[PDB]
């Protein structure tokens, strides 16, 4: 009814420990969600065009041309790690657990409140807010996944990460098909590169509406909505990283001479000439057996063209890579391709008291060593006459195409049947948790944006809207915009995310890396004197595991 | 007890024929294993560094820098074909069988003998050997695979291939994490290329010890150890090779004119103009239908950058390839990338009476025709105007990067969704049998070092050690090395490897290739007048099978 | 092919699939890891570069 609550606030994470080292981690997340009535009650097909920016030669990477259907609905998205765990919970998970499973998801809307705003004609602004007890909130659960999948974490538009801070839903929109051509150029190109937007292909048109595709529930102040429990079928997520490169696979060479005194200058020596050694190599025309030429079971990681942009029907897009750059751990400035960069606002980890539109940014460096150091790569002749001469070796400094800033590694691909790689680690708090699998016939082996992928399906998107609150002067025949009473809603969203995790075991004599609070990061986890909070990112795959 | 044997010597291979053309091949292998007490009773973290060798410009491929934990334990490894089969058994297998399955593995240690050495003070050396009836041999079976996987076949350090020749175990060591950077150079580079060893990443440290990870059994002269039967879950291994290239897939063109007289100069002719023919091609802008342009179901084999070295956290390593070079069968000198080269000593096939540290070497040429002949490759313009002109074709002789010894094929990768390839053939006697699968999330489609791969796990590594035999003057507080009575052990190792194989069938009118003894190789299988034995390599995939 | 046609010339057609999984290589490019925009000549490899 009007004066009866329809739900309870719960934001507790429970760790129920099972037998055999397994734990059920049920994270509860409760938020107060504020929603305004849509700017327009219609669906719009809006073409965003920034040909001015890309008309500058060399700016083709800044292309934003696209077409989107803007809908009157808003999306309630909780597909981010920060929506579910605080730094203490994440510390417990990443320190005491070795693998993580995604078990189930539930969400519900309760304690719906709808208020109308009456603004007076007095010259200084003044307004009052009245409860509209008969107003309704339109809630649609796309449990069949009919609507396009538009996760908000990629735009930093999920629910807020603070239980005590009210959050908002994101206005929903989806991509409409378009055709676009953009010939790349550079500073110094003469003429106007081909840069046109060709329109839309009629055979690819797909105009979706929530009304025609999903059942819609009208919730009054005394109503509540529950989606029901959804159960995932994803793969386990490892909370351990691998450190072994191809150089550290298998049996090391026997050292016939060992150091007689400790110290950094004292080295063990194999004691056998490199061309007189025993072993197996894939180089059938050389007698040298070294750490770089000896046979290994397979290849850890792969090389791909980095900062390569491929053009397709809808324009250019960067070629993704599964693994981050090698050497970003020895030198943090080397983080670039494959090291995801997260930019977020005050709702999602940035200092809440900051002013301005500049977001808080961080580049994530994974502990796994599956990356590549292209500056140390090279190609050489099949003859393999050592030491190699100039014409028989292609080095990373050799120009490709006549460009001194482009080398073969930029266009180099080593993906093959022997490539072995890991899934992307969870990124806390701004990383996505689960992502829908592509509906293609042949599917990618992994996604670079979420550690869990939906093989069959994952829970339907939740859409909310303020039902039209018409005045007495509504005329559907009029071409002017619908006249509505200014209405807004505040409702409580509660979600339950259930994981299954395995407790880690100590396999080595030495201790391992753990996340800990210290003097440097001590104040990143507590509020300031005025209430300013923040959530800094945390690494997940802290403990190491042996690859081979 | 002291005077009671605890096992029997068995080195027989049994072929028990089943119904429906299947045979159980149980190979028994018995060896006398001699073990010396470890040089040191401690674990050492030894850094092998050869910066002197790689400081020579162009010698970066000879990098041996690495770090290893040297343990006081020795590894008993029987993961090689020669440990289980003699040339007659291998001939029977490769001639009468079409596929091979790895069923089970057992090993055991018995008839343990421990002897102490007493050396006299007399000026001419003289010594006696006494049985230490109360001395113990420490045996650890890592059935849980907690320790790093270090197969010895890659170093030619498995058990000997001769039943009547006593063998030794290999001292065990494993790779410790390290960071290394090496900028490639060539003869003619000016300056000192960046060449440093950066140390160890604390987050990747993994110090393993047998004592803290595996149960240890103390075997006295009257004790024996049995691991128990382990059962594999690997894929079948084909003993047949494929000969069909993309040029030999599907229906050949109809010959409207056939030769009227036999002879090498008389050819059949299609009789239709290449641009007037019927068929399907993937080239949508050409009317030519030829043997090189006609559509095929998929691609057999693939091209990859050969003799490409990729650098990662721990230095440079050669990029592996699944298939060997094409044309190595028409010209044995073309064997290079992908054709494994085996180097071994007198225990593993080399003439036992040879003197010197030079190993016996051979490059393996597989009968399967999945390789590539890069000298016959080329790229040309999408326009496809024939005959192609200079600027519209990139040939294998065209310099890439300005280097006349490097062409596009050196950096060329054609692996894709249409690539079809075979697993590596068994290499007798020096090839590995089974290999552990990588613990990565995404796993390689095959391993280039063993025909069988351990999906879940494969039998734990066996470690042996001589238990410390202290003197009366032991003082654990002393910083000097432990003083031990010089002790060594001789024990009998018996293993049983069970395979399941299918008998081959005659599918064609003509006979097929079989391994046979002849005048040229007659004396490669019998001892010399002084007992000198050898085991030359044998090819496995002799018979052909149709790919399509 | 039209059954009443004469000659050995076959009827031909190129099939264009409606799926948009193809590539437009004329719109592709590579550029330096530094990614300083607008990109200069030596830091970009274009489809027109030999």
């Amino acid at each position, epitope marked *: 009814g009007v004066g009866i609550s329809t739900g309870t606030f719960n934001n507790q994470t429970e760790f129920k420990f099972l037998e055999n080292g397994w734990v059920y981690i049920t994270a509860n997340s409760s938020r107060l969600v504020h929603l305004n009535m849509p700017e327009s009650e219609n669906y719009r097909r809006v073409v965003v065009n920034n040909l001015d920016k890309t008309a500058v030669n060399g700016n083709m990477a800044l292309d934003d041309t696209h077409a989107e259907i803007v809908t009157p609905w808003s999306l309630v998205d909780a597909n981010a790690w920060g929506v579910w765990f605080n730094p203490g919970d994440w510390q417990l998970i990443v320190n005491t657990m070795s693998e993580l499973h995604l078990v189930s998801f539930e969400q519900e809307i309760f304690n719906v409140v709808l208020k109308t705003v009456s603004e007076s004609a007095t010259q200084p602004p003044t307004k009052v807010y009245n409860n509209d007890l008969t107003a309704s909130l339109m809630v649609a659960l796309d449990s069949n996944n009919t609507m396009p999948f538009t996760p908000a974490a990629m735009r930093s538009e999920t629910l807020g990460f603070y239980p005590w801070k009210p959050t908002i839903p994101t206005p929903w929109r989806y991509y409409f098909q378009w055709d676009r051509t953009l010939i790349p150029s550079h*500073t*110094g190109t003469s003429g106007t590169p081909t840069n046109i937007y060709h329109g839309t292909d009629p055979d690819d048109v797909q105009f979706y509406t929530i009304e025609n595709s999903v059942p819609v529930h009208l919730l009054r102040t005394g109503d509540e909505f529950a989606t029901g429990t959804f159960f995932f079928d994803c793969k386990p997520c490892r909370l351990t990283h691998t450190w072994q490169t191809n150089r550290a696979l298998g049996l090391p060479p026997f050292l016939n001479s060992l150091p007689q005194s400790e110290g950094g200058t004292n080295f063990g020596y194999i004691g056998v000439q490199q061309d007189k050694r025993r072993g197996v190599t894939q180089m059938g025309n050389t007698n040298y057996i070294t750490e770089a030429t000896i046979m290994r079971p397979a290849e850890v990681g792969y090389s791909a063209p980095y900062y390569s942009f491929e053009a397709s029907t809808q324009g250019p897009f960067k070629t993704p890579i599964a693994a981050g*750059r090698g050497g970003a751990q*020895t*030198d*943090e*400035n*080397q*983080a*670039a391709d494959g090291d995801p960069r997260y930019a977020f606002g005050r709702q999602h980890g940035q200092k809440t008291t900051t002013t301005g539109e500049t977001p808080e940014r961080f580049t994530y460096i994974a502990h796994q060593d599956t990356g590549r150091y292209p500056e140390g790569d090279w190609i050489q002749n099949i003859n393999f006459n050592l030491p190699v001469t*100039d014409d028989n070796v292609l*080095l990373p*400094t*050799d*120009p490709i195409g006549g*460009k*001194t*800033g482009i080398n073969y590694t930029n266009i180099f691909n080593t993906y093959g049947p022997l490539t072995a790689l890991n899934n992307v680690p969870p990124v806390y708090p701004n990383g996505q948790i689960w992502d829908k699998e592509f509906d293609t016939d042949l599917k990618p082996r992994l996604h670079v944006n979420a550690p869990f992928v939906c093989q069959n399906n994952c829970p339907g998107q939740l859409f909310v809207k303020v039902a039209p609150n018409l005045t007495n002067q509504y005329d559907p025949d009029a071409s002017a915009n619908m006249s509505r009473i200014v209405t807004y809603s505040d409702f409580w969203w509660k979600g339950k995310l259930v994981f299954k995790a395995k407790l880690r075991a100590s396999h080595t004599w030495n201790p391992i890396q753990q996340m800990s609070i210290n003097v440097d990061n001590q104040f990143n986890y507590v509020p300031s004197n005025i209430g300013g909070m923040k959530i800094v990112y945390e690494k997940s795959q802290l403990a190491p595991r042996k690859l081979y | 007890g002291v005077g009671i044997s605890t096992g029997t010597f068995n080195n027989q291979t049994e072929f028990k024929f089943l119904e429906n053309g299947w045979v159980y091949i149980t190979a028994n292998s018995s060896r006398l294993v001699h073990l010396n007490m470890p040089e040191s009773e401690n674990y050492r973290r030894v850094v092998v560094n050869n910066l002197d060798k790689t400081a020579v410009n162009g010698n970066m491929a000879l990098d041996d820098t690495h770090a290893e934990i040297v343990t006081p334990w020795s590894l008993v490894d029987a993961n090689a074909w020669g440990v289980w089969f003699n040339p007659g058994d291998w001939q029977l297998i490769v001639n009468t069988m079409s596929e091979l399955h790895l069923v089970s593995f057992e090993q055991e240690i018995f008839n343990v003998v421990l002897k102490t050495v007493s050396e006299s003070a007399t000026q001419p050396p003289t010594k006696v050997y006494n049985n230490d009836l109360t001395a113990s041999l420490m045996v650890a079976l890592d059935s849980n695979n907690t320790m790093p996987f270090t197969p010895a076949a890659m170093r030619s350090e498995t058990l000997g291939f001769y039943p009547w020749k006593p063998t030794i175990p290999t001292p065990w060591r494993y790779y410790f994490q390290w960071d290394r950077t090496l*900028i490639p*150079s060539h003869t*003619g*580079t*000016s*300056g*000192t*290329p*960046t*060449n440093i060893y950066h140390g160890t990443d604390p987050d990747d440290v993994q110090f393993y010890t047998i004592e803290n990870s595996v149960p240890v059994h103390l075997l006295r002269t009257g004790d024996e150890f049995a691991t128990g039967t382990f059962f594999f879950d690997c894929k079948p291994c084909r003993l047949t090779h494929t000969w069909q290239t993309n040029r030999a897939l599907g229906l050949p063109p109809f010959l409207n004119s056939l030769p009227q007289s036999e002879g090498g100069t008389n050819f059949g002719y299609i009789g239709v103009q290449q641009d007037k023919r019927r068929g399907v091609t993937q080239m949508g802008n050409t009317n030519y239908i030829t043997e090189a342009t006609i559509m095929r179901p998929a691609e057999v084999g693939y091209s990859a950058p050969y003799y490409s070295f990729e650098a990662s956290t721990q230095g440079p390593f050669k990029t592996p390839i699944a298939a060997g070079r094409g044309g190595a069968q028409t010209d044995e000198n073309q064997a290079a990338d992908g054709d494994p080269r085996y180097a071994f000593g007198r225990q593993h096939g080399q003439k036992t009476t040879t003197t010197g540290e030079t190993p016996e070497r051979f490059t393996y040429i597989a009968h399967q025709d999945t390789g590539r002949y890069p000298e016959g490759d080329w790229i040309q313009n999408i326009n496809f105007n024939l005959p192609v002109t200079d600027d519209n074709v990139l040939l294998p002789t065209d310099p890439i990067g300005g280097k006349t010894g490097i062409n596009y094929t050196n950096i060329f990768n054609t692996y894709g969704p249409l690539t079809a390839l075979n697993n590596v053939p068994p290499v007798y006697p020096n090839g590995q049998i089974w290999d552990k699968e990588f613990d990565t999330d995404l796993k390689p489609r095959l391993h280039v070092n063993a025909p069988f791969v351990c999906q879940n796990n494969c039998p734990g590594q066996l470690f042996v050690k001589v238990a410390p035999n202290l003197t009366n003057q032991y003082d654990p507080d002393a910083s000097a090395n432990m003083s031990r009575i010089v002790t060594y052990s001789d024990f009998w190792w018996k293993g049983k490897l069970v395979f399941k194989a299918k008998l081959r069938a005659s599918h064609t009118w003509n006979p097929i290739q079989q391994m046979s003894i002849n005048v040229d190789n007659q004396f490669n299988y019998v001892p010399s007048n002084i007992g000198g034995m050898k085991i030359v390599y044998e090819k496995s995939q002799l018979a052909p099978r149709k790919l399509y | 092919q039209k059954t009443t046609t004469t000659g050995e010339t076959p009827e031909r057609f190129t099939y264009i699939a409606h799926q948009d999984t193809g590539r437009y290589p004329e719109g592709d490019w590579i550029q*330096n*890891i*530094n990614f*300083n925009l607008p990109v*200069t*000549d*030596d*830091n970009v490899l274009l489809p027109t570069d030999p």
Partner: antibody, heavy 122, light 110 residues
């Protein structure tokens, strides 16, 4: 945009010490390898010191090894060159140098400061 | 010790083409040396003309071109203007993290 300003150059007697301070603006200081070059009065440019990497690894020319120390403070966006046991041969104009390639170094001085003069005389 | 040799002095008429060369007494200059060219006027700090043997910083006129000729680095000024008269210094990356500088070339526009 990218600006480098050097200071601390002053007359100093032989055998003394002096710390040159280089203030950088218009760019992320910690993301670029920095260095100190020097030009003697009437002579050509000579590389003095280089600081590179997130670990602040340092390399020095043979003429200043053991005597010069190159350091950086990214919080202050400052580069410090501390010279000890100064000699008459160290008298010169010292230029701040910034490499423009953060993830792929140009291995060359992308930006230069106005320079600070140091005179060593008894 | 590494020594970089370049022409002590060079001359060019207005609107002409001049080439300044930078070599090594022992060895050859390649793109692995990342040759850099810097321009210095009287009483002013050096200005970067070329980096990575081909790249001129934004604002550098196109008349300055960097290349590798023979076993040396080459800086070519085409249509040389009066303001191009200055001391041009060549920097070679000598591996590891060591840099070397040439003696310098005094280019005067007649």
């Amino acid at each position: 945009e990218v600006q480098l300003v050097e200071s601390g150059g002053d007359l100093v007697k032989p055998g003394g010490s002096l710390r040159l301070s280089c203030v950088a603006s218009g760019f992320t200081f910690s993301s670029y390898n920095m260095g100190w070059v020097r030009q003697a009065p009437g002579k050509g440019l000579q590389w003095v010191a280089w600081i590179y990497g997130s670990r602040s690894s340092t390399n020095y020319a043979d003429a200043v090894k053991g005597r010069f120390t190159i350091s950086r403070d990214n919080a202050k966006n400052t580069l410090y060159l501390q010279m000890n046991s100064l000699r008459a041969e160290d008298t010169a104009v010292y230029y701040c140098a910034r490499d423009g390639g953060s993830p792929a170094a140009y291995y060359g001085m992308d930006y230069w400061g106005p320079g600070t003069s140091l005179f060593v005389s008894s | 010790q590494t020594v970089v040799t370049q022409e002590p002095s060079l001359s060019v008429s207005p609107g002409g083409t001049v080439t300044l060369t930078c070599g090594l007494s022992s060895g050859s200059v390649s793109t692995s040396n990342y040759p850099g060219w810097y321009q210095q006027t009287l009483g002013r700090a050096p200005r970067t003309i070329i980096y990575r043997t081909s790249s001129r910083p934004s604002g550098v006129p196109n008349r300055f071109s960097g290349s590798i000729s023979g076993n040396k680095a080459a800086l070519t000024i085409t249509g040389a203007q009066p303001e191009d008269e200055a001391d041009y210094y060549c920097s070679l990356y000598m591996g590891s993290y060591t840099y070397v500088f040439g003696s310098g070339t005094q280019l005067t526009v007649l």
